[PDB]
């Protein structure tokens, strides 16, 4: 693929995580996985992540997102981000710091695989409270 | 720099790590950063890291590497590695997994800055274990594993 319209597709798919989109950009085959492996996650689907994202969204207000590196392997169709974020959720102010590493599909225009390693210290504090939330609410 | 000369240096980077002969491919001037940068640790100068890996080293025997990822963008001088390692301590089997941000200095010869996420997890137990170490043995190196 060549390098400018990978380049367009991971400048999209960083635009779509800035707005809260993110999955316009990735295939139908798109998978998500939780690093690290000894984490024991199970890949999330694409039917899993549309599950998963409105209930983020409805926790997560102003959400901001910083780009600190950018690392493209246009050769091997594949790209790196280390980003920030934060925004205000009913649990208090909320942080993260993202590494994923992407690959994109054959022609280079949508993202095809995403792995992803968390701030695992504030995840452990954060994800059994989300938990939490949909047990209480049964959803 | 070249992509070859930056390619080079990357493979000699990864085979001097899994050799556990690792800091010549670093410049003098290097510094590693642990991520997040909210775990507040402070940069560590080649010095600092001259001084904490022989450490490291001995106390990790049948040290292994396994690379998952390689991602090598030579048009801005950076690498990603995603990799994951094993080895036995005296405090019991070692099981890390580690995201390494490198950036080559102009010339491509060398790393010249190393942030590293790892099992933030895994590793809150493991590298206190270390400093306290360092302290019940008064190495005083003037530098900390975290």
């Known amino acids: 693929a060549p390098a400018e319209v990978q380049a367009a597709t991971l400048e999209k798919f960083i635009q779509?995580?800035?707005?809260?989109?993110?999955?316009?950009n990735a295939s139908e085959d798109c998978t998500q996985k939780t690093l690290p492996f000894s984490?024991?996650?199970?890949l999330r689907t694409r039917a899993d992540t549309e599950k998963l994202f409105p209930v983020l969204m409805s926790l997560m207000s102003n959400f901001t997102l910083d780009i600190h590196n950018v690392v493209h392997d246009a050769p091997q169709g594949k790209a790196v981000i280390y980003a920030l974020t934060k925004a205000d959720?009913?649990?208090?102010?909320?942080?993260?710091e993202h590494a994923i590493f992407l690959w994109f599909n054959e022609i280079g225009?949508?993202?095809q695989k995403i792995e992803?390693?968390?701030?695992?210290?504030?995840?452990?504090?954060?994800?059994?409270?989300?938990?939490?939330?949909?047990?209480?609410?049964?959803?």
């Open 39 to 42: 984490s024991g996650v199970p």
């Open 16 to 24: 779509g995580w800035a707005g809260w989109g993110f999955l316009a």
């Open 109 to 111: 225009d949508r993202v």
């Open 89 to 96: 959720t009913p649990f208090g102010p909320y942080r993260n």
């Open 116 to 139: 992803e390693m968390f701030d695992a210290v504030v995840m452990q504090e954060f994800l059994p409270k989300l938990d939490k939330y949909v047990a209480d609410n049964k959803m």
